[PDB]
Amino acid sequence: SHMWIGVISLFPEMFKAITEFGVTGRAVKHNLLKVECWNPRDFTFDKHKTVDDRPYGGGPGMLMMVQPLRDAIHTAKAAAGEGAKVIYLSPQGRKLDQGGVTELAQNQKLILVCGRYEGIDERLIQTEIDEEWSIGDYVLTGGELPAMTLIDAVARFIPGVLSFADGLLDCPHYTRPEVLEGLTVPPVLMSGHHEEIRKWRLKQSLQRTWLRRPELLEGLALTDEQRKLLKEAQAEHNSLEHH
């Protein structure tokens, strides 16, 4: 495969969401993407296969038990061999964005550690984790959805698998029928004028980014054409009434 992803999770079956459906599912079946899981529960030795433990200092909540998690990570690393970057999904990590996605996609092998409960022992992050990554400034019940989000995002960059690509939001899209609940498709999109359509899409992207995410535009070096189309969109905006 082009990319191999090792996963450490108490719920391996959750990953069927990406390995059995859609473009990511096709990529897996076609060996373009490989997702292999290791479950800490399989590395426990007590009668009840305990995978959590008490946090020192008290306070509510539990943490992932160290030994089972550590052993699971070691096994994954052994299978991945040298060169596999180990990532821990955490809201305290680097916030994921398209730039980070392209960076991550440069790796041939990745091992994703998914926590549960209140998280994992800080010392494991220091001794076993290479990088911490967050999918957003919000808290989820576990690292599985974040891991799948990361896998899905990077998979789009694997040759054969298939906004922010140019630092801009995407333009509106339209399909049949020509008229929907009284709303028509913009005439230009049905003119067959390839060049005019290209400009419409670019101008729409610029206008939408300016109106919805003006911050994204600031840290962007626009081409001469982009500067022109944006100025046109803003002039058009200033010639109209607004709510």
| 112 SS3 class | strand
Structure tokens at 34: 């490989």
Beta bridge partners of 36: 6
Q: Binders of a copy of itself among 81-110, rule CB under 8 A?
A: 91-92, 95-98, 100-101
Spacing of C-alpha 6 from chain mean position: 16
3-state secondary structure 127-181: HHCCEEEECCCCCCCCCHHHHHHHHHHHHCCCCCCCCCCCCCCCCCCCCCCCEEC
Out of 47, 48, 194, 243, point to the residue binding a copy of itself (CB under 8 A). 194
On the question of a cis peptide bond just before residue 12, with omega within 30 degrees of 0, the verdict is: no
Smaller CB separation from ligand SAH, 31 or 180: 180
Is 138 a known ligand-binding residue? yes
Task: Based on the shown chain and the rule CB under 8 A, indicate whether residue 56 belongs to the binding site for a copy of itself.
Answer: yes
Which residues of the chain form contacts with ligand SAH (CB under 6 A)?
89-92, 115-116, 118-119, 134-136, 138-140, 142-143, 146, 163, 170
What angle do helix axes 224-237 and 194-212 make, rounded to 10 degrees? 70
100 interface partner picked from a copy of itself, ligand SAH, none, CB below 5 to 8 A per type: a copy of itself
16 interface partner picked from ligand SAH, a copy of itself, none, CB below 5 to 8 A per type: a copy of itself
Stretch that binds a copy of itself, among 42-50, 72-80, 151-159, 218-226 (CB under 8 A): 151-159
Task: Based on the shown chain and the rule CB under 8 A, indicate whether residue 160 belongs to the binding site for a copy of itself.
Answer: no
Is 162 a known ligand-binding residue? no
